[PDB]
Structure formats: structure tokens, C-alpha cells
Write a protein that binds this ligand. Structure first.
Ligand SMILES: Nc1ncnc2c1ncn2[C@H]1C[C@H](O)[C@@H](COP(=O)(O)NP(=O)(O)OP(=O)(O)O)O1
Ligand SMILES: [Mg+2]
Ligand SMILES: [Mg+2]
Length: 430
DNA sequence: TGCACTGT
DNA sequence: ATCACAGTGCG
């Protein structure tokens, strides 16, 4: 009677299907419905792949592949390459396309921009509004034309995917308690209806397709989204969690894909998320800390309270470039010119941001990597950002890293710099 | 504050 | 020779 079940919210996670590919496919119809990928640069092995159409994924093409190697799996692979500006890749087209989608989503509910192509949605309020709009009318299956119900169909009493989807949807609806407006299952269902409408508005108004997950928290919504990609949405009810987690690898839950998740596996000697239920909260806290332990004890039961943050804009605006192998920057003149290229794109983006969103960045973060450093960043320094001036930002950034040159020869730079990073942070209203 | 960690 | 980003938590 007093055991909480984590069914107080309706949360959704929307994620664009092969987003960068869709952006290029909208612009160039010749790429539509083909095996294609978006590539970065072209000189080193045809460029690095950062996005792959589902037609190409069937040949085994993946993100991070070199295009020359992808061509070995998919000889007819088509390629759109990222725009290059001031010597570097420039992602403006995709950031702007992202804004298109985010603004549409914001018409239905407050969203948390989680990445360039996905956003969390708190639908608890909209669900209640819709629950009263209908005078206890049953939810027709025609309002959920692309929804999957995780765990269904099941039980006693065809062999195509869409047939299965309908089967599971019918079982779900036929047992829904439509008279109880407080039923969590009914609230998820209404949430799914709204997400159907949200995804329809996105495709109508931008041409982009997406998938979504609907559940009671962000981790389940995220996990649900990926169960039936692309162009489908999945509803993960509280009751579906025991079976879903019983065979769910720990690394699949958000925040457990790295070192922490591996230590959970190595220390506890378990494989699946569900196995965590057999440990006490104090046990999990003793191994992984007070916060992580409490989070794991609740999460393996499908409970999580991370709120959907009202944040439609990114908190930072950054610009970087790697200088691999022999292209490392070994002269103060080289560092001077590239710091200026970055500063110029940053000024461009910062001026636009200030005009569009009534805010100004107040701190400039400068980071570099040094050739041979095992880590991806070696130094991070911040300085005041008093003016949107590329030459000042680039001059200041040089000043804050300058002390890092171990070459008495003023013109030389050692060790060579393999990365430059400028980031505008600490925004204030303007 | 600077970095490790986690993610797209 | 992945690369270009972006958010969170620790001491
Ligand atoms: N490591 C990386 N480097 C550069 N760009 C990247 C990247 N990872 C992602 N992007 C860019 C490229 C992506 O288009 C976009 C969204 O990332 P996802 O949602 O993780 N992958 P997608 O949406 O393409 O396919 P689907 O969602 O259907 O699985 O961010
Ligand atoms: Mg995506
Ligand atoms: Mg995504």
C-alpha cells in the first residue's frame, strides 16, 4: 500500500531516424530510399561515416566506418558529405534542421533537448487534458497506427510484423480500464495517442520520420524508443518491466553503457538488469556509492525520478577540430591560424544565438590535446568572454594555452597539438 | 574550477 | 587518422 511504483508521470523520448541522412535526403531527392550515408571529409579513406540509412545498414554499414570500407560492404552506397567551412566540418544544416523539429515538439508539451536529434517530453499534463476531453470514450486502435505494446501479444490464442503489432495492440486495448482516469496504463495509452499526433505533425511539416518511446520515466522511454526502430513508437508499461529486464543486458540502460555498468557486472556477477532486484539498497550503495546505489535499486524495478528539464536550447556552443598524425600543429603560426578559424565559426554561431534567443555567453573555454596524450583532452582553461569578436576570442585562447609550449624557440610548438576546442558557456539573459 | 564519464 | 560535438557529477 505504501510501496511506490514510479507511475506518476507520462514521459516520451522522440529520436529522429538516421537524422543527418534524412536531412540530406530531403535536400537531394536522388538519395531517397537508397543505401546512403553522411560522411565527414573525403581524403582519409573516403571520409568517416557519421550517419547511415537503414537501407545501407542492411549491408552492415555502421557509424565510424571509413567510406572506402563501407563501399566494400555496399558497392552502391551513396554519400552526402558534411559542409566544410574555414578548413573544418560545419554542422549548421543539422542544427537548423534540429530546431525545426524541436519547435514543433514544443507545441504539444515542454521538451528537454537531449541531443541534436532527440528530446524528452513530459506528457503528464497533456494526458490529463485529453483524458477529460473524451467523455469516457474508449481508445480506438486507429488512433495508435504505429504503436507497439512491449510484451504483447502473449498467452493462448499472424506471421508478419504488422500482424503481430495489431495482435498485441488489441490485447492491450481490450483489457484497458477506461473508466479509471487515474490508471497508469490508460495514461500511457493516451500519451501514445499524443505522440502519434506529434510524430505526424513532425513528418507533415518537415518530411522527417522518427521513433518514440512512451513510459513513466526517461530511462524506460529511451529504452522503449529503440525497441522498434525506425518509424515506430513503443509503449513500455510498468507491468512489462519484469519480463523486459529479465533478459536485458545491463549496458542497454542509459548511464550503464560504460565503466559503471561494467563494474556492476564484474562485482555482482550478473548479466541482466532484472538480476539487480535481488540486492538491497544498502548493498548497491556499498559497491557503487550512495547516489548510484539508490538509483540502481529503483531502476531495476522500473522506477526513476530524473525530471524532464524545461530546456529547448543547448547550454553551450562549441567548436573543435582534430589534427591527427602528421597534421599536428607544430608551429605557433599554425595554432594561431586555426584558433582563428574556430573563433570565426564560433562568432558566427554566437551572434546568431544572441539574436535568436536573447542571451549572451560570458565564458570562453579553451581545450587542447597534445600529441601522445592517451586521453582525448589534455588541458581545459577558461577566460572571460566579453565580446563576440573572433580575433579577441582567438587571441585570448592563445594566451591561455601559450604557457603549454615547451619550445624555447618562440616559433616552434612542442609537443604538437592534435586538437583545438573553443566553447562558449555561462549564458545570461540579454 | 578542471577533469572523468557518458552519450549522440 | 574517428570526428564533432553536448550534459552531468566529483573532489
Ligand atoms: N559519434 C558521432 N559523431 C558525429 N556525429 C554523430 C555521432 N553520433 C551521432 N551523430 C549525429 C549523426 C546522427 O544522424 C545524429 C543522431 O544520432 P543517433 O540518433 O545516435 N543516430 P541516427 O539518428 O543517425 O540513426 P537512428 O537514430 O535511426 O539510430 O547525430
Ligand atoms: Mg537518431
Ligand atoms: Mg538520437
Amino acid at each position: 500500500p505504501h510501496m511506490a511504483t514510479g507511475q506518476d508521470r507520462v514521459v516520451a523520448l522522440v529520436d529522429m531516424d538516421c537524422f543527418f541522412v534524412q536531412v540530406e535526403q530531403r535536400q537531394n531527392p536522388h538519395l531517397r530510399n537508397k543505401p546512403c550515408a553522411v560522411v565527414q571529409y573525403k581524403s582519409w579513406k573516403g571520409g568517416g561515416i557519421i550517419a547511415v540509412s537503414y537501407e545501407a545498414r542492411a549491408f552492415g554499414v555502421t557509424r565510424s566506418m571509413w567510406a572506402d570500407d563501407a563501399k566494400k560492404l555496399c558497392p552502391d552506397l551513396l554519400l552526402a558529405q558534411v559542409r566544410e567551412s574555414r578548413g573544418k566540418a560545419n554542422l549548421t544544416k543539422y542544427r537548423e534542421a534540429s530546431v525545426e523539429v524541436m519547435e514543433i515538439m514544443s507545441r504539444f508539451a515542454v521538451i528537454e533537448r537531449a541531443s541534436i536529434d532527440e528530446a524528452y517530453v513530459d506528457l503528464t499534463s497533456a494526458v490529463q487534458e485529453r483524458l477529460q476531453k473524451l467523455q469516457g470514450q474508449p481508445i480506438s486502435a486507429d488512433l495508435l497506427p504505429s504503436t507497439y505494446i512491449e510484451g504483447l501479444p502473449q498467452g493462448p490464442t499472424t506471421v508478419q510484423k504488422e500482424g503481430m503489432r495489431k495482435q498485441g495492440l488489441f490485447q492491450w486495448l481490450d483489457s484497458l480500464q477506461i473508466d479509471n482516469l487515474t490508471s497508469p496504463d490508460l495514461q500511457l495509452t493516451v500519451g501514445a495517442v499524443i505522440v502519434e499526433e506529434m510524430r505526424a505533425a513532425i513528418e507533415r511539416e518537415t518530411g522527417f520520420q522518427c521513433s518514440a518511446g512512451i513510459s513513466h520515466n526517461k530511462v524506460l522511454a529511451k529504452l522503449a524508443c529503440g525497441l522498434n526502430k525506425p518509424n515506430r513508437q513503443t509503449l513500455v508499461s510498468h507491468g512489462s518491466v519484469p519480463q523486459l529486464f529479465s533478459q536485458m543486458p545491463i549496458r542497454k540502460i542509459r548511464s550503464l553503457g560504460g565503466k559503471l555498468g561494467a563494474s556492476v557486472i564484474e562485482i555482482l556477477g550478473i548479466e541482466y538488469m532484472g538480476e539487480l532486484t535481488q540486492f538491497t539498497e544498502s548493498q548497491l550503495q556499498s559497491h557503487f556509492g550512495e547516489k548510484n546505489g539508490s538509483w540502481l535499486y529503483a531502476m531495476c524495478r522500473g522506477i526513476e525520478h530524473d525530471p524532464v528539464k524545461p530546456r529547448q536550447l543547448p547550454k553551450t556552443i562549441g567548436c573543435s577540430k582534430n589534427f591527427p598524425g602528421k597534421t599536428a600543429l607544430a608551429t605557433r603560426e599554425q595554432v594561431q591560424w586555426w584558433l582563428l578559424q574556430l573563433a570565426q565559426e564560433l562568432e558566427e554561431r554566437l551572434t546568431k544565438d544572441r539574436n535568436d534567443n536573447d542571451r549572451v555567453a560570458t565564458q570562453l573555454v579553451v581545450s587542447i590535446r597534445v600529441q601522445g596524450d592517451k586521453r582525448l583532452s589534455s588541458l581545459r582553461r577558461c577566460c572571460a568572454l566579453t565580446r563576440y569578436d573572433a580575433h579577441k576570442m582567438s587571441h585570448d585562447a592563445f594566451t591561455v594555452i601559450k604557457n603549454m609550449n615547451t619550445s624555447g624557440i618562440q616559433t616552434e610548438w612542442s609537443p604538437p597539438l592534435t586538437m583545438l576546442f573553443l566553447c562558449a558557456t555561462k549564458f545570461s539573459a540579454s
